[PDB]
Amino acid sequence: KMIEDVVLGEVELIEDLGQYFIDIEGDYEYNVEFATLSEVDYKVCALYEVATSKTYEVPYHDKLEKEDMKLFYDKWLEKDQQEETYIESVFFVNREDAESYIKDVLKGKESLTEVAAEIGYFEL
Numbered sequence: 001k002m003i004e005d006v007v008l009g010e011v012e013l014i015e016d017l018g019q020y021f022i023d024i025e026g027d028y029e030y031n032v033e034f035a036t037l038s039e040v041d042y043k044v045c046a047l048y049e050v051a052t053s054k055t056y057e058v059p060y061h062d063k064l065e066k067e068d069m070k071l072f073y074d075k076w077l078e079k080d081q082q083e084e085t086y087i088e089s090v091f092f093v094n095r096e097d098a099e100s101y102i103k104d105v106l107k108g109k110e111s112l113t114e115v116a117a118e119i120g121y122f123e124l
Contacts, residue, residue, distance in 0.1 A: 006091060009042035014049075017095075020108030021115040022052070030058040032076050035108045037098055040091075048098040052106065053085040064121040069113045076112070 016038050023033040033054040040049050058079045060072050092098035102108040109115045117124035 003090070006047075008040075008047070008091070009044065011040060012043060013041040015039045015041070017048075018110070020102045020106070020110060021112050022106050022108045024064075024112065024116050024119055024121070026058075027063070028061055030060055030064075030072075030076070031056045032058060032080075032112070035102055035106055037095075037102060039095070048092040048095050049089050050092065050098050050101055050106070051089045052087045053080070054087060055080040055083075055085045064116055066113060066117075066122045066124070069111075069116070073112055 016036060018037050020035045020037065021032065022035060023031075025031040031054060033052070036049075036051045036053065038049045038051065040047050055076055056079075058072075058076045060075045062068070064072060090098075090101065092101065109118070113124070116122065
């Protein structure tokens with residue numbers, strides 16, 4: 001298996017490299033599963049973190065339409081900032097492996113619109 005045990009160091013800096021959306025559920029209130037890619041600088045080396053989270057009961061209270069997705073994004077972020085949504089992390093020595101993990105294992109997309117389209121809220 002490809003996963004090993006590591007004991008991490010003292011974090012100097014964390015840089016968010018992007019958010020990737022994995023799933024959208026619901027028809028009135030929405031759940032949004034997502035992953036965050038970060039570069040974590042320790043005293044002596046850096047690792048890439050892929051952190052999976054899930055936000056529940058985003059009170060968007062409207063049918064999803066492609067032209068409205070910034071509205072949906074804002075509502076999601078507003079809900080996500082209110083409560084603890086972190087689930088788990090996998091760390092990577094190199095960034096290409098972390099992005100491959102997001103893309104082909106988690107099936108994360110770079111936007112909510114892409115996920116909503118593949119689920120079937122609308123076509124793209």
